[PDB]
RNA sequence: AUGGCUGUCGUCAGCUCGUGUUGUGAAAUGUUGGGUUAAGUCCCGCAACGAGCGCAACCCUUAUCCUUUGUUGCCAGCGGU
């Protein structure tokens, strides 16, 4: 699907410097041009479409596909790419224990549902005005970190992740539950908890646009399927 | 040997717990950090997320007005002592 002639133009093949690299990433490194690692795209494209063709499978049963990015470099990009195929995101801070301790965080999805309903569908006026805003500032703080999963219900089946050592907690919560992990592993990040490592850059906004596109496109193809 | 009741630390701001995680284990996190407050007071940050008992608010008293109600209270303008 996605090939090598789009990525080099975009800026996927850039890693960090040569003092921050992870020595486990050495099967995915071409060399070091100007003190900065270059990633072999010959081992990126067959390992990017390897991850997409299984999102053909999991979107061929309407399986729940949670997208993860909290860098705030593409926090706005991860919502809209998850709202293309109306799948799920955590764009601001991943709460610790969101998946292992789900039925506790379930009680806060419900409170988010009642504060969203009361503002629009409730239409209840003439209430205590200094109390009216602590109810109102509650909504905007639960829309913030839980707002991507207001319409999910349970645990997902996949876990698409943008950085693997910025989101190391979200990997370990899907390690211990048996949810597969489809992550983008830059050359500083640890690929052990990731089941399907995808090397590349994660700081150019075009690169994370390219990733989230065809990840959503096969789930858009799966929903049509 | 106790029940009920009280003193005191001390009206000092604290003492916990479920689910989760880390640790072989006693346990730890939550409760820490940045500011702030009379205050675990509030905001922000943070593998934590939530909750309870205590922190305040609801009760009483004092302070200004307003209306209804005027005797055993009152006496302003209104007859005479
Ligand atoms: Mg243990
Ligand atoms: Mg505990
Ligand atoms: Mg503690
Ligand atoms: Mg304590
Ligand atoms: Mg503090
Ligand atoms: Mg309190």
Through-space separation of residue A161 CA and nucleotide B44 C1' in angstroms: 27
A130 touches strand B (CB under 7 A): no
A104 touches strand B (CB under 7 A): yes
Please tell me the distance from the alpha carbon of residue A192 to that of residue A90, in angstroms, as a whole number. 22
Through-space separation of residue A93 CA and nucleotide B31 C1' in angstroms: 22
A209 touches strand B (CB under 7 A): no
Max Cα-Cα span within chain A: 67
Pair (A83, A163) in one structural domain: yes
Residue A136: inside a domain:
yes
Expressed as residue numbers, the domain containing A167 is 27-94+158-225
What's the gap in Å between A156 CA and the centre of ligand 2? 26
A155 touches strand B (CB under 7 A): no
- Which residues does a gap of C–N over 2.5 Å follow in chain A? none
Axis crossing angle, helix A45-58 with helix A205-224, rounded to the nearest 10: 40
What's the gap in Å between A168 CA and the centre of ligand 4? 30
Please tell me the distance from the alpha carbon of residue A17 to that of residue A35, in angstroms, as a whole number. 6
**Experimental technique for the deposited model:** cryo-EM
Pair (A107, A142) in one structural domain: yes
Residue A204: inside a domain:
yes
Residue A19: inside a domain:
no
What's the gap in Å between A117 CA and the centre of ligand 6? 28
Sign of CA dihedral A110, A114, A116, A117: positive
Which of residues A124, A146, A168 is at a domain's end?
A: A146
Q: What is the resolution of this structure in A?
A: 3.0
Strands laid side by side in the A36-38 sheet: A14-17, A36-38, A31-33
Through-space separation of residue A124 CA and nucleotide B38 C1' in angstroms: 36
Which listed ligand is nearest to A97 at the C-alpha? 2
H runs (alpha helix) in A11-130: 45-58, 75-82, 102-117
Pair (A38, A62) in one structural domain: yes
Residue A22: inside a domain:
no
Please tell me the distance from the alpha carbon of residue A136 to that of residue A49, in angstroms, as a whole number. 44
Coil/strand/helix, residue A83: coil
Pair (A54, A130) in one structural domain: no
* Tally of structural domains, chain A: 2
A172 touches strand B (CB under 7 A): yes
A1 near A55, Cβ under 8 Å?
Answer: no
């Amino acid at each position: 699907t996605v090939s090598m002639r789009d990525m080099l133009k975009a800026g996927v093949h850039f890693g960090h410097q040569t003092r921050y690299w992870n020595p486990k990433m050495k099967p995915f490194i071409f060399g070091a041009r100007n003190k900065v690692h270059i990633i072999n795209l010959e081992k990126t494209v067959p390992m990017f479409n390897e991850a997409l063709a299984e999102l053909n499978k999991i979107a061929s049963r309407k399986g729940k596909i949670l997208f993860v990015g909290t860098k705030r470099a593409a926090s706005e990009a991860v919502k809209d790419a998850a709202l293309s195929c109306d799948q799920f995101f955590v764009n601001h801070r991943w709460l610790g224990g969101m998946l292992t301790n789900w039925k506790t965080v379930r009680q806060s999805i419900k409170r988010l549902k009642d504060l969203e309903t009361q503002s629009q569908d409730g239409t209840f006026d003439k209430l205590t005005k200094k109390e009216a805003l602590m109810r109102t500032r509650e909504l905007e703080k639960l829309e913030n970190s839980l707002g991507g999963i207001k319409d999910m219900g349970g645990l997902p089946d996949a876990l698409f992740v943008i950085d693997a050592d910025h989101e190391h907690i979200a990997i370990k919560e899907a390690n211990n539950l048996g949810i597969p992990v489809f992550a983008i592993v830059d050359t500083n990040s640890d690929p052990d908890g990731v089941d399907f490592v995808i090397p590349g850059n994660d700081d150019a906004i075009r690169a994370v646009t390219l990733y989230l596109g065809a990840v959503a496109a096969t789930v858009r193809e799966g929903r049509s399927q």
